[PDB]
Design an enzyme around this catalytic site. Structure first.
Site, PDB file in Angstrom:
ATOM      1  N   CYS A  59      53.323  41.985  37.118  1.00 51.69           N
ATOM      2  CA  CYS A  59      52.542  41.264  36.108  1.00 51.69           C
ATOM      3  C   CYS A  59      51.370  42.118  35.622  1.00 51.69           C
ATOM      4  O   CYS A  59      51.462  43.339  35.615  1.00 51.69           O
ATOM      5  CB  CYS A  59      52.026  39.927  36.670  1.00 51.69           C
ATOM      6  SG  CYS A  59      51.485  38.729  35.386  1.00 51.69           S
ATOM      7  N   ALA A  98      42.508  41.877  38.771  1.00 56.52           N
ATOM      8  CA  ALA A  98      42.035  42.173  40.117  1.00 56.52           C
ATOM      9  C   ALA A  98      42.816  43.317  40.750  1.00 56.52           C
ATOM     10  O   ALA A  98      42.238  44.201  41.379  1.00 56.52           O
ATOM     11  CB  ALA A  98      42.134  40.930  40.992  1.00 56.52           C
ATOM     12  N   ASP A 102      47.797  33.653  41.211  1.00 62.22           N
ATOM     13  CA  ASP A 102      47.349  32.601  40.306  1.00 62.22           C
ATOM     14  C   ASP A 102      46.553  31.678  41.233  1.00 62.22           C
ATOM     15  O   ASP A 102      45.534  31.101  40.838  1.00 62.22           O
ATOM     16  CB  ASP A 102      48.538  31.849  39.701  1.00 62.22           C
ATOM     17  CG  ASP A 102      48.125  30.915  38.557  1.00 62.22           C
ATOM     18  OD1 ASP A 102      47.949  31.393  37.408  1.00 62.22           O
ATOM     19  OD2 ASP A 102      47.971  29.700  38.809  1.00 62.22           O
TER      20      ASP A 102
END
Ligand SMILES: [Mg+2]
Ligand SMILES: [Mg+2]
Lengths: 320, 317, 320, 322, 317, 319
Positions: free
Chosen positions: C131, C135, C200
């Protein structure tokens, strides 16, 4: 008893150990049979086969231990026994036995080379390879891979107690191969940076388990834990028909570990065990590299069958 | 603004005169005690910052050391807790000296108590395999046996420096039967081993065990054989950091200088001191305060040395 | 409640502002303004203005994770103070203070996570990611900037192709990139030293909820013993579980997978499923990199308790 | 006089088409190579078993060299030649030898022609009504198992993975949908997420190694890994002539533009290398059974198939080598 | 200085008029409640001194009882906190009295609560395999079924005492489809089992489960088939020690005395009551306060019974 | 032209009058032996026909049995080889008769041999665990015990028929110290076990072992503890079938829970009494046969070399 002097001499050197090593020993026994076949005073197709078996029994009994010996005999005697009970003629049977032995010998002389070829195909440029003890077959894979211009590095484990690692480090370095010499206890710590594991073997069991210098199974264990491809380089004549995974578990001189002068100065309740080998489970080995090609461990029994005419018939070619 | 009684120890520590996980941690504590038993501080304010230096002093003597910063974190934590809550000289000066003395005592009885707890996990007839030369591990063995337990120890050689010979002789002297073997024989004899008892150099926040090279290999085949594996390690050996995912020692330790001169230049001798044993390969850790699961290491850091996520040493800003 | 509280809630509901950090900071800001601008004359009357203030922000997007955490952080601290017999002004102070403290920490999170994670990256490390996690990327840039020579394997990340964004971004900083289709994650895990991904949300047990594909990668990383790290801010830790009732998060528009045009070219009995996330068991995660530091997955609950005052038994701070 | 060309024109012609790729597919190639050896045996103008056998070995050698990358090709050759080498060595005469060869080839071609249907039946024995099956790429053998089970009256739903970069899943989805089978199209990344609602994994193979490892389209191993993790019965549908005597790859990087189209990639910093491996290797331990035309076997029996079907053993030469 | 009512309940736990993990826990707690409700003390120190005396007496009735010590720890922990913080008689008396009531009420809703938590993990159409006769586990099944879920339960015989027959009828009673089979059939039917739900006698500090012999065998094949394995146990069954790495019942349970007399003397009929299931073979433990990972057992000993690396119990000096 | 005694024994067999792996085997072999010894054929071709017909008659009695067909294959396969090779009448008869005799003899000394081989793999001091009541398994222990090898044997009850009682009592007689323990305790005691030795109702082409329910569970735990596990079974117990890609045999529920007690149980309850467990070849180190120890995955070789079976061929008595 009507065996040639030649045969009796070869067995003498074998029984007394003037001839050592799986390859040399096997080659010797096959050649002994070849002699009994070339220079035979026989006259009929049964006197010959009889004396041929006479010879094989002698050679066989020189060393019950020797692994390759029994196979060289089985190789030549199985094809012979098959050609024999095929009604083959005298001069006909002789031919069979001679070419079988001659073919065995040649195949064996090239064993170390071909194994090197087959194993090198599984060696890639930049591969970091870990090994154990001092195995000519394993060393031959590394050398061939280097001679093919592949950029490899070999991590050599010390291999206590006799330190065969020193010979391996020096030998490999002599060809110009970069070497990292390490204590056995460090096999796991460096398995993290190893790409391939290539070791040899004293013998292979029917289950494809590997008999080799202690520590071997330890290395295979952690190699399996890291999904590091593990190859065992071994001649077909090192394949053994019996089980050892749970049947053996040879103890060697304790002084190999702790020197005589030192050992006598030690307490009496301290016992030094010096086991020569350990047994590497088939599951911890990806493939076995032989002179005839790369095979899976559990294919060991196929080798015993196709090569030395083995079967549960449990009767040696020179027997009946 | 520091007493000579402090730098007195820091020197010996920084120079290796005072060597040993236990001794070093105790001296470090003792130091932090004196500065609290011989200090001319007006109030709690001039007092505290007076020790933050004593702690930082000893702390920089050997950042490498493991038991060093834990000893400090022990007292200093119980100090900053009271300090913050508000306290005067004889209020904080007390909790300080008090804690330092406890730690020191807890340490002196460490090996003794560890053997105690470890012994409870040793049964008559138990064959035990060990590695290197750990007093903690040996204490366990020596206690089981002194309770009338029939144990037999398998001692691994432990190359390169042969600490096995030391362990073998020592145990045999206590009248304990010993079986000496090269490291490579560890798997072979794991089949007849009941318990694996080893020491530790340090323990990580994840419960990973850092110990002499070879320890992880043994633990790996122990697990392969479902052999109960214990790691004897005192609380101050618990590191608040991660080590999974390297300390090279002198190469001549493996191959003598005179012999190594001969060897070809394209042969390097690597001598790693330790390897890292994953928590999943260790059943319990035997501390001087009880037996705990490896992954409980994070709880010991919190309770024993006051470690928190958002962290800042107890003797700094 | 005041007016600022309400005008921020809509910018959260209408999602006119998103991003785990942005909304969290905004949620905290709102409570700060309610404290800074409340005309309460009574303490107990003030406490009620805060509770309603939070209840309003909470109801804007329960689904969001950082939101309730920003509120918990501020309200837990306010609630505690209140119960100790704190005056109108002491509580106003405690709140405003906690809000600014949360805001400051959230502002430094990406940077701090970058620092904490980079300490676990070695020179020569091959890093696989998935993805487009700010971070995770922060960890990579920071390591690269410390002079560490790294190579990043970027997984394509269908259906929305985040891998493209990540590949271009990392490469633009000078970091050598290897881009591969998601299906090749296992194939290249053999040459991977570390796996760094985002999240997430993190569950009470340390399980990671992230973009579909994440668990497969973590699965094969576990298979190859490849150190796996999840980069995530403390306010992404949720008190929910995955071990209990079976919960599957949002399903997204099929046209992200197969465009509308192409899709009406397909047989009606083919359904295109597009799950947003999958769940990575805490067993396949070595460490989670938070702005406060590195922790094992099973320490997740410690974050919730000590950081957001959460309690298995207790109630929500702005409730009752 | 006995004048004639050693290798018959038909053989050189068939070999040509395989070389020029006019003939493609594991089955068609294997069938064409076997048929060539049949024609050679049917049209040889030899007058003695020895000359015939010699020409036979020449024919096979030409065919074997057309495509060293085609895996089914040499096995079709081994099947026919191994059996010819046996009859030959056993002292058979021209007539007998010609018959043995012609018969072997016919046998091989027939079995190949029926291979998909038979794999379909063997695979279906293991599919139950109501089964959710996950697949990958576009495998005729695997699809056959699915269409066969669906035709035996077993209701099944097929989760079709996209299979990037070339999107073979779309082909598989439309095709299954067309037979009337309900399909759930999904991105490759979703394999694990949906493995919990999957009953069976059925995929194909490009080739099977001596260890029983499976060489197939990138991503196959990943799926199998998560199937093992979940204990979902995993089957690989493959014809016997896809079994190989080597390990691992037995040899592939495809064109980067398959993943990132050229017009977009010319836009990317050279700093990014697009790697597009064609295959991945699935360990035999992540595979429950391999579905062959001769039946279901465990992965580690791959070596038995090689031996029984293609007279393979640890020899130095192939049956057509002197 | 203990009150009559405490010695009464104490005696019943000793002579076992009160049995069972739950009843023993609620009784022990109620005894502490009574000592606090009727104490004639007038000083906070004399009071606390009594509580510790009463606790020591309750704790010595059945030392090997699992929940007994925990019932005392729960209450006494919250008591030692209040006391050491400087609470007055009324306050401490209130804390203890409040802590006992909380624990007793909690214990009374335990089965109901555990059942609910476990049921969340039971999908409609699920097949569950159980062992022995565990109220906790049966509570999960009874609950899932009561939620309108269609499930089938495979009940293993559970030799030597056939507790499986009880579980079968009981479940059958509610109208739950049941499949009764011999223990030996565990693996053979694992292939058709969606979830394994079993109770526990006690849980170790490592999350290992102690339960009726055979439990570990079922859990082993369950993990072999990667089937979701749950263990329903009350928090008070968690114990601070390690067992992994037991009670031997009478051989007559297996082979009746009437028949065991026949058999040759060179035969021995061993009849262990429990075996130890490794935490690795269990996914979650279903507690009355929530679903946890086996390795989270240590957080329960701490969070619930204030267990730490201490050397003393809340009632010991 | 099926000889008398052939239709004779084929009756005893189809009528269960004759039962047992060995017995039905030797018996079936014998049948073919008399058929050959008392045939009234003129030439080979007509004789073979009689042989192929006497075989198919024995086979059709219990077409799903295991030992029986292996007996037939043993003799008939050897007869076909001869016939095909151009064997004359008398010769073929000789081959047949001498093959039935090999099979019968070998089969009569089967247990002795198995015990002899299995004993070689049993060490002094070893603790052996077993299941059900297996003459072959027992034979190994007995041979080991009588060898002077001090050994204890953990016997597993083996519900629902309690075969453990028989084995425990029996091994006791030979003077072997026994430890009786319920099925559920296999793992708990595997920790102290050195060797596992069990029997088999049959072996599949892939080496999987079909035996009394609970057998797979024990091999499972033995694999977990790395305990050398052995299965004792006659070569004629190998079956040319696969379990890889349903229930084998459901026994009467009353063996589990008696009629008197079961009659009172509600509809909701249903007892399943499988007779067999399928043990994967991976949890088995070696199989002990009358000809020696072999790895499970070699079962196919025993079927090929001993009984001439081959997947691409038909039974030696077909066509
Ligand atoms: Mg915790
Ligand atoms: Mg085979």
């Amino acid at each position: 008893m009507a065996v040639v002097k030649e045969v009796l001499e070869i067995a003498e050197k074998i029984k007394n150990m003037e001839i050592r090593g799986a390859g040399k020993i096997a080659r010797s026994a096959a050649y002994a049979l070849q002699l009994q076949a070339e220079k035979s005073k026989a006259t009929n197709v049964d006197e010959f086969w009889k004396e041929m078996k006479q010879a094989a029994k002698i050679l066989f009994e020189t060393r019950p231990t020797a692994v390759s010996l029994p196979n060289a005999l089985r190789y030549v005697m199985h094809r012979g026994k098959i050609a024999y009970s095929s009604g083959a003629d005298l001069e006909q049977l002789r031919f069979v036995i001679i070419n079988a032995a001659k073919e065995f010998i040649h195949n064996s002389e090239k064993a170390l080379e071909r194994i090197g070829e087959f194993g090198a195909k599984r060696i890639e440029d930049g591969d970091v390879i870990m090994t154990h003890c001092h195995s000519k077959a394993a060393i031959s894979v590394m050398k061939t891979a280097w001679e093919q211009g592949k950029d490899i590095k070999v991590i050599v484990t010390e291999t206590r107690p006799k330190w065969q690692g020193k010979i391996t480090a020096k030998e490999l370095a002599s060809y110009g191969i970069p070497v990292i010499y390490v204590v056995d206890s460090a096999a796991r710590h460096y398995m993290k940076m190893t790409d391939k594991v290539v070791m040899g073997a004293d013998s292979i069991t029917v289950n494809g388990a590997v008999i080799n210098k202690i520590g071997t199974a330890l290395i295979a264990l952690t190699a399996k834990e890291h999904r590091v491809w593990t190859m065992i380089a071994a001649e077909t004549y090192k394949f053994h028909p019996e089980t050892m995974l749970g049947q053996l578990v040879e103890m060697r001189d304790p002084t190999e570990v702790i020197p005589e002068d030192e050992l006598k100065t030690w307490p009496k309740n301290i016992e030094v065990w010096n086991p020569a080998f350990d047994v590497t489970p088939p599951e911890y080995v990806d493939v076995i590299i032989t002179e005839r090609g790369i095979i899976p461990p559990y294919a060991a029994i196929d080798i015993l069958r196709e090569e030395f005419g083995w079967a549960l018939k449990y009767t040696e070619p020179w027997e009946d």
